Short mmCIF file of N, CA and C and ligand atoms in Angstrom, two decimals:
data_model
loop_
_atom_site.label_atom_id
_atom_site.label_comp_id
_atom_site.label_asym_id
_atom_site.label_seq_id
_atom_site.Cartn_x
_atom_site.Cartn_y
_atom_site.Cartn_z
N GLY K 28 -3.78 31.17 6.97
CA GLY K 28 -3.96 31.94 6.01
C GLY K 28 -3.53 30.69 4.68
N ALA K 29 -3.67 31.05 3.51
CA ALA K 29 -3.39 30.15 2.43
C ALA K 29 -2.10 29.72 2.45
N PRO K 30 -1.03 30.34 2.51
CA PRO K 30 0.37 29.65 2.74
C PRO K 30 0.39 28.60 3.78
N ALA K 31 0.17 29.01 4.68
CA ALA K 31 0.12 28.24 6.20
C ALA K 31 -0.55 26.75 5.83
N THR K 32 -1.94 26.94 5.02
CA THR K 32 -2.40 25.99 5.11
C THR K 32 -2.00 24.88 3.60
N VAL K 33 -1.27 25.31 2.57
CA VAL K 33 -0.67 24.57 1.77
C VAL K 33 0.63 24.36 2.54
N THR K 34 1.29 24.60 2.97
CA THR K 34 2.42 24.23 3.90
C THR K 34 1.80 22.90 5.14
N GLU K 35 0.77 23.30 5.71
CA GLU K 35 0.67 22.24 6.77
C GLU K 35 -0.43 21.28 6.07
N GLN K 36 -1.00 21.33 4.81
CA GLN K 36 -2.14 20.27 4.44
C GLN K 36 -2.04 19.83 2.93
N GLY K 37 -0.86 20.33 2.64
CA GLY K 37 -0.67 20.09 0.97
C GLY K 37 0.21 18.56 0.80
N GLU K 38 0.10 18.06 -0.42
CA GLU K 38 0.18 16.68 -0.85
C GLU K 38 2.00 17.24 -1.40
N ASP K 39 2.78 16.14 -1.02
CA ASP K 39 3.79 16.19 -1.65
C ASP K 39 3.70 15.38 -3.01
N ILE K 40 4.21 16.46 -4.20
CA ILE K 40 3.94 15.78 -5.32
C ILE K 40 5.41 15.75 -6.06
N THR K 41 6.37 15.82 -5.22
CA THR K 41 7.78 15.34 -5.91
C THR K 41 8.08 14.03 -6.07
N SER K 42 8.92 13.54 -7.24
CA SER K 42 9.11 11.82 -6.98
C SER K 42 9.94 11.52 -6.30
N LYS K 43 11.04 12.56 -5.81
CA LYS K 43 11.79 12.24 -4.64
C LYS K 43 11.25 12.20 -3.27
N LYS K 44 9.89 12.45 -3.19
CA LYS K 44 9.05 12.22 -1.95
C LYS K 44 10.02 13.22 -0.63
N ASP K 45 10.47 14.41 -1.07
CA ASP K 45 11.10 15.18 0.12
C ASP K 45 10.79 15.64 0.24
N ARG K 46 9.35 16.44 -0.11
CA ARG K 46 8.40 17.69 0.78
C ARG K 46 8.78 18.77 -0.02
N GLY K 47 9.68 18.58 -1.33
CA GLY K 47 9.83 20.26 -1.72
C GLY K 47 8.99 21.02 -2.57
N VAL K 48 7.77 20.44 -2.91
CA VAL K 48 7.11 20.67 -3.63
C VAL K 48 5.47 20.31 -3.13
N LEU K 49 4.60 20.85 -2.31
CA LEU K 49 3.31 20.79 -2.03
C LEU K 49 2.26 21.54 -2.55
N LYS K 50 1.06 20.55 -2.79
CA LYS K 50 -0.05 20.85 -3.48
C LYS K 50 -1.43 20.65 -3.09
N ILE K 51 -2.14 21.87 -3.39
CA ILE K 51 -3.71 21.72 -2.91
C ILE K 51 -4.62 22.10 -4.30
N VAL K 52 -5.11 20.90 -4.43
CA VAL K 52 -6.39 21.41 -5.80
C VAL K 52 -7.26 22.20 -5.10
N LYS K 53 -7.51 23.49 -5.87
CA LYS K 53 -8.59 24.46 -5.25
C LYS K 53 -9.69 24.03 -6.56
N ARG K 54 -9.57 24.39 -7.32
CA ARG K 54 -10.52 24.05 -8.36
C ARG K 54 -10.21 22.79 -9.12
N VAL K 55 -11.24 22.16 -8.96
CA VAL K 55 -11.47 20.54 -9.99
C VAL K 55 -11.20 21.24 -11.33
N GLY K 56 -10.61 20.70 -12.40
CA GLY K 56 -10.60 20.99 -13.78
C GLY K 56 -11.45 19.76 -14.69
N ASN K 57 -10.83 19.97 -15.74
CA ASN K 57 -11.47 19.47 -17.02
C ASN K 57 -11.10 17.78 -17.14
N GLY K 58 -11.96 16.80 -17.38
CA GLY K 58 -11.52 15.56 -17.84
C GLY K 58 -10.50 14.90 -16.79
N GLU K 59 -9.73 14.43 -17.84
CA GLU K 59 -8.61 13.44 -16.74
C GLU K 59 -7.49 13.70 -17.40
N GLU K 60 -7.25 14.57 -18.50
CA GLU K 60 -6.10 14.52 -19.24
C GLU K 60 -5.32 15.78 -18.68
N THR K 61 -3.75 15.61 -18.23
CA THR K 61 -2.83 16.47 -17.82
C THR K 61 -1.68 17.14 -19.32
N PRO K 62 -1.04 18.12 -19.18
CA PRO K 62 -0.34 17.96 -20.45
C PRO K 62 0.50 17.04 -20.62
N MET K 63 1.14 17.09 -22.02
CA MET K 63 2.40 16.85 -22.27
C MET K 63 3.73 17.29 -22.41
N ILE K 64 4.75 16.62 -21.82
CA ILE K 64 6.36 17.21 -22.25
C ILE K 64 6.44 17.96 -23.26
N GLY K 65 6.65 18.96 -22.88
CA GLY K 65 6.97 19.78 -24.33
C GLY K 65 5.65 20.61 -24.92
N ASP K 66 4.64 20.49 -24.35
CA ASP K 66 3.27 20.86 -24.66
C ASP K 66 3.73 22.90 -24.31
N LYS K 67 2.83 23.39 -25.42
CA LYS K 67 2.74 24.92 -24.86
C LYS K 67 1.71 24.88 -23.74
N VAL K 68 1.97 25.20 -22.43
CA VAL K 68 1.03 25.72 -21.85
C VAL K 68 0.59 27.09 -21.18
N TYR K 69 -0.50 27.41 -21.30
CA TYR K 69 -1.13 28.58 -20.99
C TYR K 69 -1.28 29.07 -19.19
N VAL K 70 -0.46 29.98 -18.26
CA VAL K 70 -1.31 29.89 -17.08
C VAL K 70 -1.48 31.41 -16.27
N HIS K 71 -2.37 31.52 -15.40
CA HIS K 71 -2.45 32.78 -14.54
C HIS K 71 -1.83 32.02 -13.38
N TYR K 72 -0.62 33.18 -12.78
CA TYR K 72 -0.35 33.06 -11.78
C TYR K 72 -0.36 33.89 -10.50
N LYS K 73 -0.41 34.43 -9.39
CA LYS K 73 0.20 35.42 -8.44
C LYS K 73 1.21 34.25 -7.74
N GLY K 74 2.34 34.93 -7.20
CA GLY K 74 3.65 34.35 -6.20
C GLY K 74 3.22 35.35 -5.04
N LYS K 75 4.01 34.63 -3.71
CA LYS K 75 4.32 35.37 -2.79
C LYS K 75 5.24 34.61 -2.05
N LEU K 76 6.18 35.99 -1.30
CA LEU K 76 7.01 35.62 -0.51
C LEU K 76 6.40 35.04 0.76
N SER K 77 7.67 34.55 1.58
CA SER K 77 7.25 33.75 2.81
C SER K 77 6.84 34.84 4.04
N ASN K 78 7.48 36.24 3.38
CA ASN K 78 7.21 37.62 4.42
C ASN K 78 5.85 38.24 4.12
N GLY K 79 5.04 37.70 3.31
CA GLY K 79 3.59 37.90 2.49
C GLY K 79 3.64 39.05 1.25
N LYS K 80 4.77 39.27 1.12
CA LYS K 80 4.97 40.49 0.21
C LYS K 80 4.41 39.61 -1.54
N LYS K 81 3.78 40.24 -2.22
CA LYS K 81 3.23 39.49 -3.48
C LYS K 81 4.63 40.14 -4.27
N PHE K 82 5.30 39.25 -5.29
CA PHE K 82 6.29 39.32 -5.85
C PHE K 82 6.30 39.52 -7.53
N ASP K 83 4.92 38.60 -7.89
CA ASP K 83 5.04 38.67 -9.13
C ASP K 83 3.24 37.84 -9.47
N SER K 84 2.44 38.35 -10.60
CA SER K 84 1.29 38.04 -11.00
C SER K 84 1.20 38.69 -12.49
N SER K 85 0.67 37.47 -12.99
CA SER K 85 -0.05 37.46 -14.59
C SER K 85 -1.20 38.13 -14.81
N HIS K 86 -1.96 38.09 -13.62
CA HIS K 86 -3.39 38.74 -13.79
C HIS K 86 -3.21 40.45 -13.76
N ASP K 87 -2.20 40.65 -13.31
CA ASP K 87 -1.62 42.36 -13.30
C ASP K 87 -1.17 42.74 -14.69
N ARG K 88 -0.81 41.73 -15.36
CA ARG K 88 -0.49 42.04 -16.64
C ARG K 88 -1.55 41.95 -17.92
N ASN K 89 -2.47 41.64 -17.46
CA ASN K 89 -3.73 41.06 -19.00
C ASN K 89 -2.94 40.33 -19.42
N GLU K 90 -2.10 39.00 -19.25
CA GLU K 90 -1.98 38.59 -20.00
C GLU K 90 -1.53 37.01 -19.21
N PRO K 91 -1.39 35.95 -19.97
CA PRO K 91 -0.73 34.83 -19.52
C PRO K 91 0.37 34.81 -19.62
N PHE K 92 0.94 33.72 -18.83
CA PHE K 92 2.38 33.62 -18.94
C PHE K 92 2.38 31.95 -19.78
N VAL K 93 3.15 31.70 -20.48
CA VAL K 93 3.10 30.67 -21.62
C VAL K 93 4.72 30.36 -21.48
N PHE K 94 4.91 28.76 -21.62
CA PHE K 94 6.10 28.31 -21.71
C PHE K 94 5.70 26.76 -22.12
N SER K 95 7.08 25.99 -22.65
CA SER K 95 7.11 24.69 -22.96
C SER K 95 7.31 23.77 -21.58
N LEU K 96 6.48 22.93 -21.23
CA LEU K 96 6.30 22.30 -19.98
C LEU K 96 7.51 20.98 -20.16
N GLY K 97 8.18 21.15 -18.68
CA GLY K 97 9.38 19.98 -18.78
C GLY K 97 10.31 20.15 -19.33
N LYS K 98 10.83 21.27 -19.68
CA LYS K 98 11.93 21.90 -20.35
C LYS K 98 12.82 22.70 -19.70
N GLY K 99 12.64 23.32 -18.21
CA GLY K 99 13.48 23.93 -17.20
C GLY K 99 13.33 25.35 -17.66
N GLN K 100 12.45 25.61 -18.22
CA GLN K 100 12.31 27.11 -18.37
C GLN K 100 11.74 28.07 -17.58
N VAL K 101 11.03 27.29 -16.37
CA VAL K 101 10.70 27.72 -15.30
C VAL K 101 11.23 26.98 -14.16
N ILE K 102 11.16 27.49 -12.80
CA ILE K 102 11.61 26.36 -11.80
C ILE K 102 11.37 25.32 -11.74
N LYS K 103 11.57 24.22 -11.14
CA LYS K 103 11.48 23.06 -10.98
C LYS K 103 9.94 22.80 -10.39
N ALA K 104 9.67 23.37 -9.66
CA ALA K 104 8.23 23.56 -8.85
C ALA K 104 7.16 23.60 -10.03
N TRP K 105 7.52 24.47 -10.81
CA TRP K 105 6.43 24.87 -11.64
C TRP K 105 5.86 23.90 -13.01
N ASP K 106 7.74 23.34 -13.30
CA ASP K 106 7.78 22.05 -14.37
C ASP K 106 6.52 20.78 -13.97
N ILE K 107 7.29 20.59 -12.33
CA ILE K 107 6.53 19.12 -11.67
C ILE K 107 4.91 19.62 -11.59
N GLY K 108 4.43 20.64 -10.90
CA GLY K 108 3.48 21.02 -10.51
C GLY K 108 2.57 21.25 -11.75
N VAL K 109 2.55 22.02 -12.73
CA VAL K 109 1.77 22.07 -14.06
C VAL K 109 1.67 20.97 -14.66
N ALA K 110 2.86 19.81 -14.56
CA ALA K 110 2.73 18.50 -14.87
C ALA K 110 1.41 17.46 -14.51
N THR K 111 0.82 18.22 -13.39
CA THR K 111 -0.37 17.30 -12.59
C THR K 111 -1.12 17.89 -12.68
N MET K 112 -1.33 18.98 -13.42
CA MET K 112 -2.69 19.59 -13.46
C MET K 112 -3.74 19.45 -14.76
N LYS K 113 -5.30 19.77 -14.71
CA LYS K 113 -5.80 19.23 -15.89
C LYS K 113 -6.48 20.66 -16.12
N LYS K 114 -6.73 21.05 -17.52
CA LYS K 114 -7.05 22.41 -17.97
C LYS K 114 -8.61 22.73 -17.32
N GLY K 115 -7.99 23.91 -17.01
CA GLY K 115 -9.10 24.81 -15.91
C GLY K 115 -9.26 24.46 -14.65
N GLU K 116 -8.19 23.62 -14.08
CA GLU K 116 -7.82 23.66 -12.80
C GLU K 116 -6.60 24.60 -11.92
N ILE K 117 -7.34 25.27 -10.88
CA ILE K 117 -6.61 25.80 -9.98
C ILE K 117 -5.91 25.35 -8.74
N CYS K 118 -4.85 25.47 -8.64
CA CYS K 118 -4.02 24.70 -7.11
C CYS K 118 -3.22 25.84 -6.70
N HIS K 119 -2.74 25.60 -5.64
CA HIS K 119 -1.86 26.47 -4.75
C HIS K 119 -0.55 25.43 -4.69
N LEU K 120 0.57 25.98 -4.87
CA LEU K 120 1.82 25.37 -4.59
C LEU K 120 2.87 25.61 -3.54
N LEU K 121 3.27 25.16 -2.73
CA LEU K 121 4.35 25.60 -1.82
C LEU K 121 5.57 25.02 -1.72
N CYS K 122 6.41 25.74 -2.47
CA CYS K 122 8.11 25.35 -3.50
C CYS K 122 9.10 25.64 -2.15
N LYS K 123 9.62 24.70 -1.77
CA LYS K 123 10.87 25.04 -1.06
C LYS K 123 12.01 25.63 -2.16
N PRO K 124 13.46 25.80 -1.74
CA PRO K 124 14.36 26.96 -2.75
C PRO K 124 14.91 25.92 -3.31
N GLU K 125 14.84 24.71 -3.16
CA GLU K 125 15.58 23.42 -3.96
C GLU K 125 14.93 23.50 -5.56
N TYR K 126 13.57 23.68 -5.56
CA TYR K 126 12.85 23.59 -6.29
C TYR K 126 12.40 24.88 -7.16
N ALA K 127 12.51 26.09 -6.38
CA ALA K 127 12.82 27.15 -6.94
C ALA K 127 13.86 27.84 -7.56
N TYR K 128 14.49 29.34 -6.60
CA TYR K 128 15.69 29.67 -7.14
C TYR K 128 17.04 29.51 -6.12
N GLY K 129 16.73 28.78 -5.37
CA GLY K 129 18.21 28.22 -4.45
C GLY K 129 18.68 29.22 -3.60
N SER K 130 19.69 28.93 -3.48
CA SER K 130 20.67 30.22 -3.00
C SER K 130 21.30 31.17 -3.33
N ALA K 131 20.65 31.29 -5.12
CA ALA K 131 20.95 32.49 -5.74
C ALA K 131 19.64 33.53 -5.56
N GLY K 132 18.84 33.29 -5.19
CA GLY K 132 17.47 34.17 -5.31
C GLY K 132 17.29 34.81 -6.73
N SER K 133 16.53 35.54 -6.83
CA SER K 133 16.09 36.22 -8.64
C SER K 133 15.84 37.74 -8.23
N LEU K 134 16.57 38.41 -8.56
CA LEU K 134 16.53 39.93 -8.39
C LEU K 134 15.36 40.23 -9.37
N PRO K 135 14.66 41.24 -9.01
CA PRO K 135 14.88 42.06 -7.83
C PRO K 135 13.86 41.91 -6.55
N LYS K 136 13.54 40.72 -6.31
CA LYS K 136 12.55 40.63 -5.40
C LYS K 136 12.39 39.66 -4.30
N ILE K 137 13.05 38.25 -5.26
CA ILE K 137 13.45 37.09 -4.54
C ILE K 137 14.90 36.77 -3.95
N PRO K 138 14.57 36.74 -2.64
CA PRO K 138 16.21 37.11 -1.82
C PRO K 138 16.14 35.15 -1.91
N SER K 139 17.73 35.20 -1.09
CA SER K 139 18.15 33.92 -1.08
C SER K 139 17.45 32.68 -0.28
N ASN K 140 17.35 31.63 -0.69
CA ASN K 140 16.77 30.35 0.11
C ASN K 140 14.88 30.73 0.42
N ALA K 141 14.85 31.33 -0.71
CA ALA K 141 13.44 31.65 -0.50
C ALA K 141 12.42 30.33 -0.82
N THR K 142 11.10 30.34 0.13
CA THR K 142 10.05 29.48 -0.03
C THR K 142 8.93 30.11 -0.62
N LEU K 143 8.44 29.75 -1.54
CA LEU K 143 7.35 30.48 -2.37
C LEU K 143 6.11 30.16 -2.28
N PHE K 144 5.27 30.76 -2.69
CA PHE K 144 3.27 30.29 -2.72
C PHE K 144 3.04 30.89 -3.83
N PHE K 145 2.52 29.83 -4.91
CA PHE K 145 1.88 30.36 -6.00
C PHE K 145 0.19 29.68 -6.08
N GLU K 146 -0.34 30.54 -6.41
CA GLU K 146 -1.68 30.28 -7.29
C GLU K 146 -1.58 30.22 -8.39
N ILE K 147 -2.25 28.97 -8.97
CA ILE K 147 -1.53 28.62 -10.80
C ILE K 147 -2.88 28.21 -11.01
N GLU K 148 -3.49 28.46 -12.17
CA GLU K 148 -4.41 28.48 -12.92
C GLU K 148 -4.06 28.03 -14.65
N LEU K 149 -4.41 26.70 -14.68
CA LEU K 149 -4.06 26.37 -15.96
C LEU K 149 -4.78 26.48 -16.98
N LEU K 150 -4.81 27.52 -17.98
CA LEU K 150 -5.97 27.94 -18.92
C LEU K 150 -5.98 26.96 -19.93
N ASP K 151 -4.76 26.21 -20.61
CA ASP K 151 -4.98 25.70 -21.29
C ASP K 151 -3.68 25.06 -22.08
N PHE K 152 -3.41 23.75 -22.79
CA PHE K 152 -2.27 23.30 -23.17
C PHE K 152 -2.25 22.82 -24.42
N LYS K 153 -1.42 23.00 -25.35
CA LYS K 153 -1.34 22.57 -26.94
C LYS K 153 -0.19 22.02 -27.04
N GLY K 154 -0.16 20.90 -27.71
CA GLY K 154 0.78 20.14 -28.47
C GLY K 154 1.32 21.11 -29.85
N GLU K 155 2.69 21.36 -30.21
CA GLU K 155 2.84 22.24 -31.21
C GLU K 155 3.90 21.79 -32.47
CL1 CL Q 23 -4.58 33.50 2.56
NA1 NA Q 24 -7.67 26.66 3.15
NA1 NA Q 25 -4.83 17.57 -10.81
#
C-alpha cells in the first residue's frame, strides 16, 4: 500500500541524507515557489502508524492545520517536508522517529520509536 511504496520508492529529502524523511509527490502543485521560513502554512493531512491505525486527520475536523514554517512548531519531518512543497501539492512522507516523536512518543496514540506515514496537501502559504 501507500506506506510500503513511500518506504521503498520515496526520495530522501533530509540535508543529512540519512533516509529519515522520504517523500513522493502525488499531485504536482502550482508554479515553482515553495514557502519561506516563518510563513503561515495551511495544510490538510492524514497520519497513520506502522500498524495501520489512523492517528490524526484534519479533514475529519473540517479545518486545516496552520503553523509557522521552520520554527519547530511541528515535528522535524513536517518542517523539512512542507518546505519542499508547492501550493496545491499533495505528497506522502515516511518519517522515522528521529524526525518525529522519538523515544517519547505522543499520547494518546503515538508509541515510542514510531515511524509515521502522512499524506499532506499544502493549501496555502502567506508571509505575515
Ligand atoms: Cl495504501
Ligand atoms: Na503507489
Ligand atoms: Na515540490
